[PDB]
């Protein structure tokens, strides 16, 4: 790889999403270890012209998590006991 | 001058007064044999994380 | 000499007079945000003592430093890829154009890829990659900048083709001539106003492309963001090195010469030296880069949500994705940075005329629905605030509330009934 | 792996405590770790400068972990910043700003308390279910261009419709859904059907 050489990990042409990342595009998985380059997406073409459009004709009620962390833990350090005790 | 390096051809030539060579970084790259004039670039041996 | 803000500008206010803009300009601004830093990582124990063996044993009486250097430079390092992550991969579908390019007179050829580079850039991207110029190692980034570029590709192709839609969910096509209409819609000007001026639209919309591309041709400060990110971490990285070469107190700044002219008693002591020196300068680059990195995350999460709210849809938040009435945006991978082209509205060729909040007539008083009212001198008409568009002021867009005796400034008119 | 934000902040705080603690078996360069034992086999002439050794190596090492819990401290000062700005938006509020509050259009949102966290439920509205229409920008109408009000004029195929943008709802192109504007002289892709009149 341009990270470096790896070894004990089989290269395989397919692609897959990034499990562990080596670097360079190169990812890991388990499957035996694998290392391949990393697809980005599934590849979608949008049937564009310039007269049609795409309209919904129903809808999702999408409901997900958004976790952000807002304090840590209020740590203090007796400066002389820790140096002196 | 003493290190630990990979002593390969250098194309660069020196003046004959210069003796050792240095880069930007301040680090000997390239150096002069005593015993015959010739001119030897020290690559680091490759190091690397494991 | 003493330096002047601006020029004046007295603003011909009173309180019956209103400017109304007859013209626009499609303009379009560049903002460049950088992302990521070269990930570096510091064997601290070759950093501090190299090859010696006495060296690295002084140097395990101190302890776990060098374990929390390394941690911190990789923590550094993986938040790189991160903000690259955040900033780039907002699409899981990767779209592209299809092969005719018929967008009612709309010319993306600058921005998009082209078929004829080896590494798939588009002309404006391939120019932003030519503007940009021990146990020390680079570790080199997740994504590679074909990829990011085909993550700017995606992205051109979905905003192109399918509008804002294809950010909220589904990708759903629409012509361009009609999501530009939707956009003139969501700054508050009429669709019909986009479909009667379409070519005009479309040729300003080439020239300020042109004219973005000949300005970054032309300019060699207008890269400075990322330059300067460069910049601090080279400077950084080789003020690391040089201070090797310094013996901080000792009689010599090299571990062979002192192992080789002293005794271990005394060369502990000159190692010692050595070490404290070189562990100090590690950690003084280490809090330094910590900061920089903080400083990086900011932009890069800046760069997220001008990626989120000026790419993926139209955003009514002013000067947040360019001067002006904001558009669209389109997103250019750049050297460890995002350039958003901001296309904007920009009102022009503004006219006087008087105005009135309300019309009386038939004892009743009379606002706009969506307009205003102007007047040219002898005749009321109503018409839209961001583009004059005079129309007979009829019931359908007048609204009735009240009489005239509460409202300070109503003029009489009549009110056509259709 | 669902609340990694919150352990990995808790794991990161508890690292460094740990390495801060781990510090003092170090000796520095001296020749105990223990203070008691220096102060117990040497005079102070030079358990002086033992203590000095430890003394400089763990006030290095209070500095660097002081270092380290200020930077964390502007982090997480960060997404908490973050965390309020998206508790006035999106649950007080209904935002506009795209991918702000979750995946597609917003809806609303739900606060969550979390250890040392917030969870948001963002509940949004997603388009699914799409149809292909045949679309035009205006309808010409007794040489009038007519244009949506709020809607798109699209046609399944022999009829014209005028509906919402985001939910496919046809409806008959009157005039009460529709303004007019020009003739169909300088509209591109102006198309001829009739406008209705209640
Ligand atoms: C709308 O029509 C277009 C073209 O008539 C459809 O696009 C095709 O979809 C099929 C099925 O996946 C593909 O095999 C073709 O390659 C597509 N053509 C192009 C040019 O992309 C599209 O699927 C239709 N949309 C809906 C919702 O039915
Ligand atoms: C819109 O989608 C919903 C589901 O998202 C459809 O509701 C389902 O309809 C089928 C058949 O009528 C039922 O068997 C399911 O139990 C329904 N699911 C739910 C959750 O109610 C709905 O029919 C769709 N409507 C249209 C017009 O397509
Ligand atoms: C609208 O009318 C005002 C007043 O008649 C104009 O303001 C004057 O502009 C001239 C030319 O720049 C100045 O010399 C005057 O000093 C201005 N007067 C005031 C009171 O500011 C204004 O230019 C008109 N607007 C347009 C678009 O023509
Ligand atoms: C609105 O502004 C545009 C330019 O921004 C005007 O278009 C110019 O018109 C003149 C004379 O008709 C031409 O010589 C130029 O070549 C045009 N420029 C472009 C870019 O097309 C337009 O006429 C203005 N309209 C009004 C009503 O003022
Ligand atoms: C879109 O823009 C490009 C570039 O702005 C146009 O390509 C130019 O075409 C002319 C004549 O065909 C050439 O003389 C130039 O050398 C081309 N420039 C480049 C950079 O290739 C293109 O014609 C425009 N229109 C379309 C439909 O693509
Ligand atoms: C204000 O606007 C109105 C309508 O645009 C102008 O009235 C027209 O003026 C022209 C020029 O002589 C006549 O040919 C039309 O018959 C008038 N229409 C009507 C309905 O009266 C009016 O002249 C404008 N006033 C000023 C001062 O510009
Ligand atoms: C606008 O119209 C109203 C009503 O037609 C005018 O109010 C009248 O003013 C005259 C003299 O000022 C009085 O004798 C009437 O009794 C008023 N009628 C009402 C119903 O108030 C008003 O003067 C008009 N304003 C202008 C500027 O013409
Ligand atoms: C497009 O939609 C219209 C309205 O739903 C359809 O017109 C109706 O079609 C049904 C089925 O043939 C008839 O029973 C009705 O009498 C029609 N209504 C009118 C007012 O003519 C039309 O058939 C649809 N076209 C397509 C191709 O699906
Ligand atoms: C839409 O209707 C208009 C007017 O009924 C049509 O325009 C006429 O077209 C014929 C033949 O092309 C000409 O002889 C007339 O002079 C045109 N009249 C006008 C006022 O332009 C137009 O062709 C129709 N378009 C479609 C697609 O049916
Ligand atoms: C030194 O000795 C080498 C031995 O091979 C010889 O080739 C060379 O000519 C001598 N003189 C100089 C000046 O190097
Ligand atoms: C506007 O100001 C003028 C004096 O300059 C005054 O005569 C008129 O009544 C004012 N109109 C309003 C609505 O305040
Ligand atoms: C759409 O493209 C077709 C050719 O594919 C052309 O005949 C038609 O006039 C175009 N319509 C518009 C509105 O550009």
């Not at chain 3, 932009?299 to 994705?321: I, W």
């Not at chain 3, 940075?337 to 022009?348: D, K």
Request: some cysteine; aromatic content about 8%.
């Amino acid at each position: 790889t341009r990270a470096g050489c790896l070894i004990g990990a089989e290269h395989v042409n397919n692609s897959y999403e990034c499990d562990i990342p080596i670097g360079a595009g190169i990812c890991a998985s388990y499957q035996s270890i694998i290392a391949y380059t990393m697809s980005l997406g599934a590849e979608n073409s949008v049937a564009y012209s310039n007269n049609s459009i795409a309209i919904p004709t129903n809808f999702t009620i999408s409901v997900t998590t958004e976790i952000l962390p807002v304090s840590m833990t209020k740590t203090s350090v007796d400066c002389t006991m820790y140096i002196c005790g | 001058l003493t290190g630990t390096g990979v002593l390969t051809e250098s194309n660069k030539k020196f003046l004959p007064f210069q003796q050792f060579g240095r880069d930007i970084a301040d680090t000997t790259d390239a150096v002069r044999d005593p015993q015959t004039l010739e001119i030897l670039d020290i690559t680091p041996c490759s190091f690397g994380g494991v | 000499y003493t330096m002047s803000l601006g020029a004046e500008n007295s603003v011909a206010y009173s309180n019956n007079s209103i400017a109304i803009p007859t013209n626009f300009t499609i303009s379009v601004t560049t903002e460049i945000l950088p992302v990521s830093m070269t990930k570096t990582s510091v064997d601290c124990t070759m950093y501090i003592c190299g090859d010696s063996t006495e060296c690295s044993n002084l140097l395990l009486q101190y302890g776990s430093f060098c374990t929390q250097l390394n941690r911190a430079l990789t923590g550094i390092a993986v938040e790189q890829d991160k903000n690259t992550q955040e900033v780039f991969a907002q699409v899981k579908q990767i779209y592209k154009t299809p092969p005719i390019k018929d967008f009612g007179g709309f010319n993306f050829s600058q921005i998009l890829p082209d078929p004829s580079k080896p590494s798939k850039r588009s002309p404006i991207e391939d120019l932003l990659f030519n503007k940009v110029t021990n146990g020390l190692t680079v570790l080199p980034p997740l994504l590679t900048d074909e990829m990011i570029a085909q993550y700017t590709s995606a992205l051109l192709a979905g905003t192109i083709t399918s509008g804002w839609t294809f950010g909220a969910g589904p990708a759903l096509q629409i012509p361009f001539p009609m999501q530009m209409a939707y956009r003139f819609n969501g700054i508050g000007v009429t669709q019909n106003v986009l479909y009667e001026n379409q070519k005009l639209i479309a040729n300003q919309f080439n020239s300020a492309i042109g004219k973005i591309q000949d300005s970054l041709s032309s300019t060699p400060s207008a890269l400075g963001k990322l330059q300067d990110v460069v910049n601090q971490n080279a400077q950084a990285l080789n003020t690391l090195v040089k201070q090797l070469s310094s013996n901080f107190g000792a009689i010599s700044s090299v571990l062979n010469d002192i192992l080789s002219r002293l005794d271990p008693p005394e060369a502990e002591v000159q190692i010692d030296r050595l070490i404290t020196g070189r562990l100090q300068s590690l950690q003084t680059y280490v809090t330094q880069q910590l900061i920089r990195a903080a400083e990086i995350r900011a932009s890069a999460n800046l760069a997220a949500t001008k990626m989120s709210e000026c790419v993926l849809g139209q955003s009514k938040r002013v000067d947040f994705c360019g001067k002006g009435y904001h558009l669209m945006s389109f997103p250019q991978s750049a050297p460890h940075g995002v350039v958003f082209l901001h296309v904007t509205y920009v009102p022009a060729q503004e006219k006087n005329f008087t105005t009135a909040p309300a019309i009386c007539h038939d004892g009743k008083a009379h606002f706009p629905r969506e307009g205003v009212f102007v007047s040219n001198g002898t005749h009321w008409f109503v018409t839209q605030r961001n583009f004059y568009e005079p129309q007979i002021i009829t019931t359908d867009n007048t609204f009735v509330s009240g009489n005239c005796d509460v409202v300070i400034g109503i003029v009489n008119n009549t009110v056509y009934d259709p």
